[PDB]
């Protein structure tokens, strides 16, 4: 009975992601439960500051999680120790910037300066990446020990997102290994349609690939003068804070 | 049915952790069998609110940054704010403002006019020179060290009012001055015959999100009115920023 | 106690009345004693919402107007759409922006994206083109004929994208069909990759105060999803319009 | 009793002047009467328009009113025949810009372009005015005929709103005189402190003074070349204006 916890976190997921605000009645009759009870998660949500309640007794998300989330991105020095480098890779492109932490076989975003317009591209922080369709990805599979790479080709599935979502493992390789080459990666809107990225890895202590940057921006953007562009600021950051990681 | 408690509570301490915890180690801590705590564990894995590593010990997930930004992302200082600015209002009579900081601009996301008070042309989504009002000083005023020493390292100081600060060093001494007395006061630098008085709101990791304000023909701001003012502020402005987190 | 009825039903024809009328001329027209007909007239004078000519006989007084542009100034057109926003969100779950018409330029008032649309660069508080938007557009075809005219010989029609319309005549005769259509499409005109769909939210006057829009991946935007998305738009705008008196 | 009428104009007043919202509890509690009664006067504003019921059944002012205003404004061809003068008067200048419309010894506010900043003045349409103390008030006081004339000084007290206001009337009535020369008036902080104005009239059919257009704004701006800049726009416009008044 204890996973009361699930509905718990159900309720809150749920005020999270809607639109707007909601009342007691209203989560009540969402989770078949009387007015009674919904006060029984709702108060403590709210005492906890998940949520806030409205002068109109309606609910809206708290400054709780917000707080959450500053916390464990603090767990990350790489992204103290490059924020501001993506600030000005933006404002030396125009281009929106991301930088992608490398945790096993997918990325995450954890951090992102959006560029001066808006991009068909859906990313946010917290928010995971394929190492495999996207550039910051392919970059960082560029350079994880041939042994581990090994494994991660054995493994993950390249389910093709677009027409041109690589999903032959020997083209994959072949294809990381023209990244070793020229140093990046570039998705030719292998991860999204109508995007397209240029990426550059990130070394640590011993030299292993732990994040990705990359530029991001829509596919008419990217022309060959223009990537050779974009793949050289990021490069030169990418040095910059790969030398901070001790490397 | 208030173990709602102890997990949130749980995730609290995990997530302020600095290091990990394994299970057996919450269940010691939270005082709980090794059973039970595996079930809260169980969930906030689940829902992804915590990761195991492979050592077993456990650290926050990353659907905590998933949440948060998109929870920061709409979160609305306006609609939290607008009762306590019209509140402002009531005891003062004078129009009042908030202003958002957007890098070194401030937007204006709202304010309360009353039929007494003086007719501004300022309105909705219109930038604010952070260096020449009230609520923009008062954000610069705790802006982070490195931060501010940018701001007027590229910021262009114009010359806009007689009595405007132009001067860097002259403006950084007013925002420590300002930084100490807690409040900001615009003596005519950013139009000539008006004069207002503003506060900061921090959000739950000190920074200066946003100003409020009181503006009013400058006669008006007598050195007790403007303490006055001020007072009214700062009260109105402490229960906006705790409800950011502060 | 429902005098209160012929009360504002006097004031109302009086408003109204391009004319004047008489004390002895309402009791006659509302069915009333000439004693009763000069109490919601001595009321409506007293309070200042008529005046008495010297001929006695009555027109609407300066109050008003008074009254009328104090409310316009605080009018809050963003409290009073938001919800139908939100809601114009639940059923298409495509970002959704709420634009304010700022002269010749465009303003950001409110914006609900969801967790599946783009993230969307544009915030309160932002200037818009009228010219490269469908909002914006949907709010040039219907200014007043001299206005637009004006906007037209004034405006810089810039070339940000490769769709942005730059020809005058050639976006009049858009605006014509926007106008027949009674919704405006941005097809990649503003930015690149990124279509809308928007219409216009008129006043009490029938003028083009605002505008709603959809804002989404150009892929997604074909013929059915457009007229899909527009319908959507326009219900909830005819709701908007008719809450600010049209 | 049947002043309830009263009552109802009271509510409605309040409500317009309230800064915010208001809920049928409160009007209750704020005009002594059960929420019931409040109901009978609120459900009739509301369904007039007066009145505009939230989702959280608080009230906020409806449209009507503004509506009403129109209507009014809309009964002086002078209003259109002028306005955009007045907006180009804003353009040329950057100061605000005022059209007062005679009515007997009083003036009132019928049409007003702010400028580029705020000034310390509190005006707003449908306001009144002191045809004294105001330089488009003494414009018009410098062309009403002598006999009418003679009549306001012996009538209207001239209550001093600042050690400016002139309260003499041989003072006045040479000061009339002098704006009768020049063709325009001037008010050195004679209505409000810290602002300070040029006015001009605008004739009518039988040249009769029936408006008010002057110029608005804080008084270190109006300097002697400054005064005559725009008292020059003014006339300008004036004549202009004048000329569709059948002039
Ligand atoms: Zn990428
Ligand atoms: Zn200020
Ligand atoms: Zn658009
Ligand atoms: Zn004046």
């Known amino acids: 009975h204890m996973n009361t916890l699930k509905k718990a ?26 007015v009674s009870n919904a006060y029984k998660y709702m108060v403590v949500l709210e ?6 309640r409205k002068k109109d007794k309606r609910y809206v998300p708290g400054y709780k999680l917000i707080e959450y989330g500053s916390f464990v991105l603090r767990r990350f020095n790489i992204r103290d120790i490059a924020h501001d480098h993506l600030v000005d890779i933006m404002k030396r492109t125009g281009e929106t910037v991301h930088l992608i932490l490398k945790d096993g076989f997918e990325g995450v ?30 970059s960082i599979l560029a350079f994880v020990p041939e042994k581990e790479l090994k494994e991660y080709l054995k493994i993950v599935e390249l ?3 677009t027409p041109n ?14 990244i070793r080459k020229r140093g990046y990666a570039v ?13 550059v890895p990130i070394f640590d202590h011993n030299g292993y690939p732990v994040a990705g940057v990359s530029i ?11 990537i050779e562009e974009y793949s050289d600021v990021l490069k ?8 901070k990681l001790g490397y």
């Open 165 to 178: 979502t690589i999903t032959n493992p020997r083209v994959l390789k072949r294809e990381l290994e023209k």
């Open 47 to 52: 005492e906890k500051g998940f949520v806030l």
């Open 109 to 138: 975003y954890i951090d992102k300066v959006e560029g001066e317009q808006s991009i068909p591209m859906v990313s946010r922080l917290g928010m995971k990446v394929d190492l495999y369709s996207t550039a910051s990805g392919k």
């Open 236 to 243: 030169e950051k990418a040095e910059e804070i790969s030398r």
């Open 216 to 226: 991001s921006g829509v596919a008419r953007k990217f022309t060959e003068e223009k």
């Open 9 to 34: 976190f159900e309720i809150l997921d749920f005020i999270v992601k809607n639109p707007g605000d909601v009342s007691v009645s209203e989560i009540a009759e969402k989770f078949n439960m009387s």
């Open 187 to 199: 998705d030719n809107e292998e991860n999204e349609i109508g995007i397209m990225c240029v990426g």
């Open 159 to 161: 389910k093709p997102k």
